[PDB]
Amino acid sequence: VNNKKISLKISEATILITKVVRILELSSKCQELITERKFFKVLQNLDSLEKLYLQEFKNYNFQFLIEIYNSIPFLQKVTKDECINLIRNSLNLNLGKNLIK
Amino acid sequence: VPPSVFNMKVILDPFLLFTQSTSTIVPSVLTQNTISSLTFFDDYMNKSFLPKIQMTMDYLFTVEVESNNPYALELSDENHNIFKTALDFQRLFYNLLNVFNTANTFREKISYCILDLLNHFYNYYLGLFNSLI
Amino acid sequence: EFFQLDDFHDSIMIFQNLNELSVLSGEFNKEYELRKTKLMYPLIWKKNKFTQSLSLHFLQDYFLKILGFLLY
Amino acid sequence: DYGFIPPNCNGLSCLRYLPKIVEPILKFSTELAQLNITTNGITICRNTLSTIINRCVGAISSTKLRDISNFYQLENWQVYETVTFSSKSQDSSKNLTFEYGVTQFPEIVTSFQEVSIKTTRDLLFAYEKLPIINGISVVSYPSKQLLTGIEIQQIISMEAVLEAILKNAAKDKDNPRNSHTILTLTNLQYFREC
Amino acid sequence: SLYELDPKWKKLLKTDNFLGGLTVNEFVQELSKDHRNDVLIDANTKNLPTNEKDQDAIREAIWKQLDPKPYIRTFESTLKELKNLNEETLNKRQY
Amino acid sequence: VTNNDIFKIISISHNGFTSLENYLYNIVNIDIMEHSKTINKNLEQFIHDQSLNKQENEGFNRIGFLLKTINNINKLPVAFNIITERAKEEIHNIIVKSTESIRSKHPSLLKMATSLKNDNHFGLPVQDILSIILRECFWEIFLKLLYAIQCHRAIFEMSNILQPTSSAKPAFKFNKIWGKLLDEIELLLVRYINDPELISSNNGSIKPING
Amino acid sequence: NNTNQDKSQGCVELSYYLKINQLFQIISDTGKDSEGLKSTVEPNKVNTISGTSYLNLNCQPSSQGLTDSPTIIEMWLLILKYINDLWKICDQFIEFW
């Protein structure tokens, strides 16, 4: 029970560390998804994030939502942010103009 | 050709140390007494790597087509086009890469870069064979 | 005023992976052009394409004024 | 050490690499007869050491000179590149702004480094330095040849001002072409305090 | 923004944290990432096709409303890492 | 064992580029003094172990292959066994195995494809950046395969030349005649899969016209 | 080097062709700066304006005295290989005697 104590703080410490790691990665993806109507650090910081989470930084098989999220986010964030920005200023193309006369 | 790659112009990492086996088993030296189909260095450096250099040059010219009869920036002029300073950048880059000294330096790698020049004069000849002609 | 500022930054971020990322704006500009060019003596007709008589002096200064600011 | 034709020289190539191929043979010698086995060939190291050493230092000097005469030729087709000055006037009033012509600054370097290398051939014979002492080279040795090094370096700086003489006067007619030929007097004016 | 992001995890994770004790620290790795009461509802996120009325943006927000949900829950598991630091407090007591 | 005490191990300090002083291309390869060494070793123990019965760099070859390979009592099928296993499965085992070892060792195949370095940035980073790896990799491949087909010429001699003890020698002779036709095939495709990515060639799916 | 030469005689102008600014401040980086200050040598036009000190390390791989690919192969390979081998031989004789 001193080795259940030391074992408890041991695996509690390690699971605290990995919990801090996945907390960091999902925190970064929250920092990505938070950015609406900016579209500029979207590909910059988001593509910086995808270079770590699905990639080498969190490349254990650890979660499902980390794996499916960071594996998914190519087409979702890239295609959705992409065509979001494409139909952005088509709004302005409708707004440019009606002030012709 | 669909440039997946044959290998590349990236044999400069590989093809140094993989000539040691072409010279320590000296291809093919030992290889004791039979009919063994010796060289094999070249035979791909004859066939494969040379045609891969030729078509690799050709696709490299297709990374400077840019679809403009013309447009450019040109501190002194119009200079028509990005095509022009493209083929300047290409032939300057490759003609620093593929040969500097030694003039052959080449089986026909000289004649390869000569063929890149010949294609460039074919295309910018074709612009005048289209706009004027 | 900022009439291409969105098109500017749009073309920047989309031009990280140019250029089909901004090629459909050719289509949207051709379409909403073809609405704004239209019509008033119908005037999406300039693609080898009555309504002639739906035009007079106020419609004239209207028409070539509005097309003039379109060219601007 | 050249090695090839052009550039052990202008092209600081024996100026860098010649210290390496110098220094290993120096340690190999100093050890190789620091074992005192036995006698009267430690003389032969005392001959061969200073032979290759002084011949080498002469070689770097010769490269540096015939190099540095070609320096300002095909170099300063430039503009007021490097800096500035702070030379006070006759009324001691802030009158510089004397600038720049970077061929000043390059030849301010390529002799200082050669001073560092020849410092590492004159003062080479300190750090070896073991028993017997079979000290086969003197740490502050050749006062005759030290005076000769003073002579060759003086000839080097004289070759510098000759190089601005030829490059200024006729090579060919453009410091740019009067177009600040005052550039050339600006460079010389910096050279009076460089 | 409390342990209501991990409500049944006060049993479904914390009892498996209290007397579990973590069994077997791959479940604390992966099944606490499959995340009893938090990301055991991990289905249909999904950035919903079809066309952007239905929905493609709310389910895209719910593609990472585990960044809301399982990270105020994993953050609540980081708040339970403070309870694991409380387990490291008493694990600093009996040690 | 005594085949290229490694270049580019490591770095003669400082003297770092040219590629190093070791290579390039001062690692001659002339005909190689390296190949005078190795092709002196196998000619030494081959015709001098043969001449003997008509660490010495590398005594394990003729030593272990001798006292191993002569102490077989029904050897003649087992020669075909080591042949027919080792050709395909060994050649693809090594040539797979090294590229696997780098392919997860410090990969990071980041510099994923070219990082779009145009176009004709053709192995640009050597210059000692990230083609310091692949030179050591493909160098270690052609080195290991060299000592391999060396040694298969050394058993294709060692007892087959000359009937120690079996005058049915043409087994391992076939395992040079199609031993070397094995390995020269297995390198040749490893030529064609040096495609311009650091292609890493570890998938194996073969799909027909229907997915 | 050079057959059918520049003729004559094939200098690189290497104290420009390298040392316009080069190893001129990289081989001279254990060489420069040693009190080699700037005095507004922020090169105020365009490019060579880093120049603070120690390090802001560029810190050039320094191809050679620049255009010497093969001549740095010559000085390097010849002089360093031969003298390296003789260092090994004198080591073995140092043990022997």
Added chain:
Amino acid sequence: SQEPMLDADRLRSSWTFSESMDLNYSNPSSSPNSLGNLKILLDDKASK
């Protein structure tokens, strides 16, 4: 073909590697005759 010195163009050489981009053409190498030659080579390369 004349390189010659540049710097031009873009990454201040942007190619600069350059082992004939891939060769030495390292014949065996083993062939030091060198012929005292020639033009370099008109060879119809001048005609090219």
Added chain:
Amino acid sequence: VTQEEFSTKRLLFKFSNSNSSLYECRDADECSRLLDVIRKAKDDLCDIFHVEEENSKRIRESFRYLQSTQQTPGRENNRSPNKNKRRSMGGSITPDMSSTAQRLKFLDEGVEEIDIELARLRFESAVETLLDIESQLEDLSLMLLNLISLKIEQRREAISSKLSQSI
């Protein structure tokens, strides 16, 4: 060794890398005590040497050789005029940049804001933003800092060229 008793109790799923074992224990008490004692060999695997500092400190010292210096020299090395897959250490395992280069790291995103503002031809504010970045950079000048200044002067070139075309 997966815990696949859900498809079949008294059966095991040991899929070692490029393999798969259906090594079916006959009783399930040997299966439950087998994956249970392999979960106690995850109290030996997952507790003894899973990582616990191993991938942690291996990621520390191994990540600590990042772009080019660990391992200083150097006589075949430089990283002056490039980005060359630029290791964004702020977004990497440092996240905790020094508030000089942290607050200028967001002004490195302010440098990218200058790239937006240049990219819409609005020079003025981006120029003065760059003046602020020169001010804080200038004053509070710990190693990557210099490379940040390289990007800064790169973009000062971009401005000077761009205005001199635009005028």
